[PDB]
């Protein structure tokens, strides 16, 4: 499975490693939310990352299904 990742700048797509079969997207507000919007974290995962009261995490199993919120998935 190919996943988008914020581990690189610019954001890139990578073949997720053995064991990591899900692509995920985490977003949350920090002090700059009102102007820059939520922080965006994208990557690979074996299992969906725990969500917090202030975290928004979504998981999926299709190629590049976790794009930056402003870009089309796939």
């Amino acid at each position: 499975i190919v996943c988008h990742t914020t581990a690189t700048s610019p954001i890139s797509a990578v073949t997720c490693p053995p064991g990591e079969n899900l692509c995920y997207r985490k977003m949350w507000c920090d002090v700059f939310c009102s102007s820059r919007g939520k922080v965006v974290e994208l990557g690979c995962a074996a299992t969906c990352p725990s969500k917090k009261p202030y975290e928004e995490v979504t998981c999926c199993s299709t190629d590049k299904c976790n794009p930056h919120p402003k870009q089309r998935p796939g």
Binding site: I11, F32, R36, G37, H68, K70
Partner: protein
């Protein structure tokens, strides 16, 4: 001396703008060297796990429009000027426990004839600390301070750590706590507003431990 310094200051600011980045061409990314200096832990709130610290944030960058020739001003090669008069990157602490931004004092900057600026404003930071619950007793906490430009993103201004470790050469130790480890890490962070341009931050952290 003072006669020439007064002269060059008027010259430098007769047609200066602190609103635009000090680069000759807007394509250029301003390079800012950032170095956190820890001065003293002044308050420890163990119930909320918040520590208040006195610091100084050393910042260095070159201002294209603030150059001159020492020979034209009696050999003067450096001068001190109010930080409020020049463009600044607006580096801010943004994980301030109480308030949403720390207390700072805009002190004077050191400017040399090459346009190189050295600014070391003092500040009072309030940081949340994470208890290191690995070993007993759990008398160790990890406090962090995240710094980054308030408005500019990575394609306009780049902040680079002056060193991998904060400067503790002027740190006044406590009689009850010791800083066991301290380091700064630079990150490239993406926000929902902007899919292509990352925002930069340097996060410094220090692990402090209660003395027996």
């Amino acid at each position: 001396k003072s006669e020439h310094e007064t002269r060059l200051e008027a010259k430098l600011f007769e047609d200066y703008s602190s609103v635009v980045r000090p680069v000759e061409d807007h394509r250029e990314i301003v390079q800012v060297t950032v170095g956190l200096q820890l001065i003293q832990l002044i308050n420890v709130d163990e119930v909320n796990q918040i520590v208040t610290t006195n610091v100084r944030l050393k910042q260095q960058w070159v201002d294209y429009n603030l150059k001159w020739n020492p020979d034209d001003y009696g050999g003067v090669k450096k001068i001190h000027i109010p930080s409020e008069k020049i463009w600044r990157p607006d580096v801010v602490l943004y994980n301030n426990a109480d308030g949403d931004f720390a207390i700072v004092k805009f002190t004077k900057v050191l400017l040399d004839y090459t346009g190189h600026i050295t600014w070391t404003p003092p500040a009072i930071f309030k940081s949340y600390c994470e208890i290191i619950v690995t070993h007993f007793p759990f008398d160790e906490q990890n406090c962090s301070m995240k710094l980054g430009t308030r408005t500019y993103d990575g394609s306009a201004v780049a902040i680079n750590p002056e060193s991998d470790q904060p400067d503790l050469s002027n740190f006044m130790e406590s009689g009850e706590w010791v800083i066991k480890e301290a380091r700064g890490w630079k990150h490239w962070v993406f926000y929902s507003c902007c899919p292509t341009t990352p925002y930069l931050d340097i996060t410094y952290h220090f692990v402090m431990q209660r003395l027996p």
